[PDB]
Design a protein around this ligand. Sequence first.
Ligand SMILES: [Ca+2]
Ligand SMILES: [Ca+2]
Ligand SMILES: [Ca+2]
Ligand SMILES: [Ca+2]
Ligand SMILES: [Ca+2]
Ligand SMILES: [Ca+2]
Ligand SMILES: [Ca+2]
Ligand SMILES: [Cl-]
Ligand SMILES: [K+]
Lengths: 238, 208
Amino acid sequence: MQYDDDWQYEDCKLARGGPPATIVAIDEESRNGTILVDNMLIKGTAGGPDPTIELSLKDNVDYWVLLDPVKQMLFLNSTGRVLDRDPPMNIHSIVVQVQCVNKKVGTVIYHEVRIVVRDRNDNSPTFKHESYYATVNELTPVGTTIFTGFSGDNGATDIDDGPNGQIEYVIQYNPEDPTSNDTFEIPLMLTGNVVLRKRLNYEDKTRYYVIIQANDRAQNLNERRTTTTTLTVDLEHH
Amino acid sequence: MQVNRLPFFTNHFFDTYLLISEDTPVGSSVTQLLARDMDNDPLVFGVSGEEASRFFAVEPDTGVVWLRQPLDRETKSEFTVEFSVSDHQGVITRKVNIQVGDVNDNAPTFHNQPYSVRIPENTPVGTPIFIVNATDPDLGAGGSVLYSFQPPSPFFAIDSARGIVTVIQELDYEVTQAYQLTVNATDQDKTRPLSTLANLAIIITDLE
Ligand SMILES: [Ca+2]
Ligand SMILES: [Ca+2]
Ligand SMILES: [Ca+2]
Ligand SMILES: [Ca+2]
Ligand SMILES: [Ca+2]
Ligand SMILES: [Ca+2]
Ligand SMILES: [Ca+2]
Ligand SMILES: [Cl-]
Ligand SMILES: [K+]
């Protein structure tokens, strides 16, 4: 009967239903040998003494993926380097093709694999400068914004993606200048702009050391990262 | 006085990707945006960007995302889309990678047509005389082509994987001067295989 030989064509076809592409996710900077695909689920036997198929990798850009044809497993090859999702490497995904050749009939089927690289909160906020400064006139009204130096990446930045890379600024109490966190405020944590909260008096105090901490916005509070800078505020008379 | 707290998305898909099959019907919901606001503010959802906005729509009050026009993995296999959520005082955005899932929706296309070849009547059995080729852009089995004659010819065979045509029986010009064979190129999709026909003319040249 016609199609009685169709069994010969089964090797290299997927041994699973669902869509043709195989898509997985792994964390950036996973260690060498991390399993990417535990089992490609391709019909047939590769390797061994009587294989029915030949499996290999195509379009393996920079050789990030290693294939064990016997187990049909794909692993990360990252010895001597790191799979970095953040700049400057910017690896958000890896796409490779698992080429399958059917030995009996010579047909070739390509099984696309997409590895989605997840961002980790592996970077802390970093300030562009080692310290910040503002000069404020003694007559400045309370409520006036007196420092905007964190505007347009001059403050803290964080190279992670999403909330992991978004910054919040808060003023901390300074034991060596106790009144500084009472005299100045950051009412809007996203900008880090500093506002005068109390009337100044040049005859009493001429310099304030304001401790400002930047944190990122990682979902898990215990995975958040923080960095601190000092804003020195000097009063002017004239 | 409490300053406004801006809303934030909670979907876990923002940390990975969103997969939408290319056969998703227009008008169909593909996901629902979720967000929270520390002020308990009612939130309005949207989509930003020229090209994204042409493919996706968003119900403003629910965050339900739906398909505004058909997807086509063979025309565009992924989008980066920026979604928005607003509490009426500010708007925040966040991007997601959308991967377009494949379905078998193309038939093979033949290369180098038209197909015609002249061969002498004394061409030996086993001689390769012609090579057909077709390609197919779908993924996996849906893109792997098999060749056949429809119906099989007792004088010519075609390699199902390679498209090589061979003479399989001694020819006789006075019996048949020309053959018009139909070549079928099919993909190997399990549920919805697609195929295409091409003519192959084989002209037999006389010896006497
Ligand atoms: Ca990194
Ligand atoms: Ca970070
Ligand atoms: Ca990161
Ligand atoms: Ca709010
Ligand atoms: Ca398509
Ligand atoms: Ca397709
Ligand atoms: Ca196809
Ligand atoms: Cl040819
Ligand atoms: K960032």
